[PDB]
Ligand SMILES: CC(C)(C)NC(=O)[C@@H]1C[C@@H]2CCCC[C@@H]2CN1C[C@@H](O)[C@H](Cc1ccccc1)NC(=O)[C@H](CC(N)=O)NC(=O)c1ccc2ccccc2n1
């Protein structure tokens with residue numbers, strides 16, 4: 222689809238058996254989701270943006286369905302105010318910015 | 321252009337006669353730039369990022385060129401780690417996200 226930017230570009234995602242809303246975020250290197258359980262091993266990470274850094278758990282090789290399109294990649298889990306789909310997964314669903 | 325997301329979507333902007341690098345960010349509601357001087361009066365705003373809130377100066381009706389496309393709109397100035405072009409100006413240059 223073509224998504225305009227008059228409002229936040231929020232989509233439904235499926236991750237870990239759960240439906241969530243997330244922001245399609247070209248300004249994010251990483252995909253960061255609010256607290257949830259994910260299977261497998263993880264490692265701690267610090268990620269930053271405006272306002273500084275938060276501590277997250279890094280899970281690798283996680284499958285997500287983003288607006289109907291499946292992708293696999295690293296997912297970070299922690300106290301983000303909004304769930305964000307960053308470039309590591311946007312690339313996999315073929316997302317581009319066009320103007 | 322069509323901008324893919326394998327790398328950060330960094331473009332050149334021109335503001336106050338100066339060239340700067342900035343991130344085209346569909347996840348950002350607002351445009352925020354690192355400290356610089358802009359003309360006129362400003363108003364206060366607090367904006368929230370992944371790591372918390374920062375105080376910024378809001379300048380309205382600022383002339384800015386984004387990857388060659390002219391816009392005139394609101395620019396926030398403050399302690400952002402990266403210059404960010406948000407949806408308020410992405411919509412003026414006709415940007416969409418497509419997949
Ligand atoms: C810029 C502002 C107007 C405040 N908007 C936002 O910041 C909104 C806030 C929303 C609610 C909280 C959760 C994040 C979302 C999306 N963000 C936009 C969102 O696109 C935001 C923009 C950004 C980029 C770089 C530096 C700072 C900020 N990106 C991010 O926060 C991501 C998070 C991550 N993946 O690690 N940061 C980065 O990708 C990133 C890249 C370079 C950096 C350099 C130094 C310091 C930090 C750096 N962070």
Ligand code: NA
Pocket residue numbers: 260261262280281282283
């Ligand atoms: Na894993």
